[PDB]
Amino acid sequence: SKKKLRRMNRFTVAELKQLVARPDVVEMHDVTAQDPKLLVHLKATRNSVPVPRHWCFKRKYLQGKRGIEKPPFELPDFIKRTGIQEMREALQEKEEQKTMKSKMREKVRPKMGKIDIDYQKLHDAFFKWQTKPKLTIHGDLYYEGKEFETRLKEKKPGDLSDELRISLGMPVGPNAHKVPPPWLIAMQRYGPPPSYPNLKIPGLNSPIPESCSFGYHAGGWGKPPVDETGKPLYGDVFGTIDRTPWGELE
């Protein structure tokens, strides 16, 4: 029939990826386009923004945000320190304790002007300490399950964590520099790994991190790995305008 003929009229995902000039894009959604050469040229244009994840899914948009426990909302700093938030928390706790009776009584013999609104505290929050939140630039749609996602493609060696340091035996904080991790030890001993030969280890193939210490006890840099003639294992394990804006308002 017509559907069967055009289904056979359709091609292989390898057909596509080899035809196309930019093969990163190809997916079976495109392989299922009634005009896949277009669809792929479009998806490979500059600056364009791909369809959301979730048209395939059977679950609706954030019904996946449903099941796990979710916290409510955390105010901006400049409003916590503006003393209308605390005002509102206090009034809340008051009226949650009071008995049905008392709410009707406050409506009647009212506590008129319990707390006068504070000015210049507010007006300075909103007009003197208001600040840019964290925004996400063009393209990065929010989808459900974003919090889960594993995070990868930091092939960099210097990438360390504080729990990583703790549960590996190394230091957390300003000493994450002057702390060569227990893997830089065998980096100095028999070399850094031969798929990160484009990685230099700090204190083992790189110079001293800020104010490092040479020595062979716990807490130092040891022998920066060098040849018998003096050249290090690699790199250097020891270590040897007018940006003013034009239109601006202070």
């Binding site: 504080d162 230091p171 904080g173 300003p174 000493n175 104010s211 210490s213 040479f214 130092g220």
Partner: protein, 114 residues
């Protein structure tokens, strides 16, 4: 109280026959300087935890001139001497107070403490 001292290091003397009071020179900062560092910075990370008192520490004292050793006293009736550099080990524990130790002071040379 019965006076007792526990050395926790196997070796009292280094490879030159010197005590652990000898100001180290393998430290990347000159601990014999009388001049302060040109500029200080605020600490950001916890580097080390000396664990080994069984009650709260009541005072801490650095070694005079050089700061390479640390004395601590505690409500556990013990005084402890620690390395600030190297492997940061407990070097010695002094025992002989019948009650909690409140304060401690080195002499100017650091050879003795009260």
């Amino acid at each position: 109280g019965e006076e007792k001292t526990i050395l926790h290091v196997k070796e009292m003397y280094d490879y030159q026959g010197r005590s652990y009071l000898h100001i180290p020179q393998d430290v990347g900062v000159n601990l014999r300087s009388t001049m302060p560092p040109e500029k200080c910075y605020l600490p950001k990370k916890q580097i080390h935890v000396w664990s080994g008192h069984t009650k709260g520490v009541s005072a801490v004292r650095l070694f005079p001139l050089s700061g390479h050793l640390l004395l601590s006293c505690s409500m556990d009736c013990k005084i402890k001497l620690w390395e600030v550099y190297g492997e940061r080990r407990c070097l010695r524990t002094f025992i002989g107070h019948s009650k909690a130790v409140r304060d401690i002071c080195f002499n100017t040379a650091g050879t003795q403490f009260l």
